[PDB]
Design a protein around this ligand. Structure first.
Ligand SMILES: [Ca+2]
Ligand SMILES: [Ca+2]
Length: 166
């Protein structure tokens, strides 16, 4: 496929705990909000339990901040053409039931093109998919995934297989 995002399945990244949140995982920016006082752990896992390849990203939430994006994994850059309609697809599961995640796509002004908001994540892998249109003149966009929900404290969420395709 003609994919707009880079390293969507983490297959380019060495397994281990991420200590470089900005540049340790090619094609993604991980960050933690200054309001989060019990920080999360991000880890690339090498596993047979992957929907794609053998790597997944595991996000362990230990506490939250003020905003759901205060614990996030954002695909960036996401290279796109104005006016085009894309299909976003990703897989996610959690260690315990009751996890909540938002899968968004938006521009550098932090306006969304679309999202799957506050999705219930279960202990089995499930696909989350939506279409969105680049409705402005942007060519470099981003795909923020929000993990900072109280529901997630004590849980680990696993993501894999992000594809943003024409
Ligand atoms: Ca993968
Ligand atoms: Ca980066």
């Amino acid at each position: 496929m003609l994919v707009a995002n880079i390293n969507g399945g983490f297959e380019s990244t060495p397994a281990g705990v991420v200590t470089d949140l900005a540049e340790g995982v090619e094609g993604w920016d991980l960050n933690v909000g200054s309001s989060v006082t019990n920080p999360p752990v991000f880890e690339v896992l090498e596993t047979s339990d992957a929907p794609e390849g053998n790597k997944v990203l595991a996000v362990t939430v230990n506490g939250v901040g003020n905003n759901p994006y205060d614990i996030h994994a954002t695909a960036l850059p996401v290279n796109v053409r104005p006016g085009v309609t894309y299909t976003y697809t990703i897989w996610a599961r959690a260690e315990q039931d009751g996890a909540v995640v938002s899968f968004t796509v938006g521009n550098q002004s932090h306006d969304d093109y679309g999202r799957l908001h506050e999705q219930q994540i279960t202990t089995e892998w499930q696909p989350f998919t939506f279409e969105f249109t680049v409705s402005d003149q942007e060519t470099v966009i981003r795909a923020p995934i929000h993990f900072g929900f109280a529901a997630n404290v004590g849980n680990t969420i696993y993501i894999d297989g992000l594809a943003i395709v024409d």
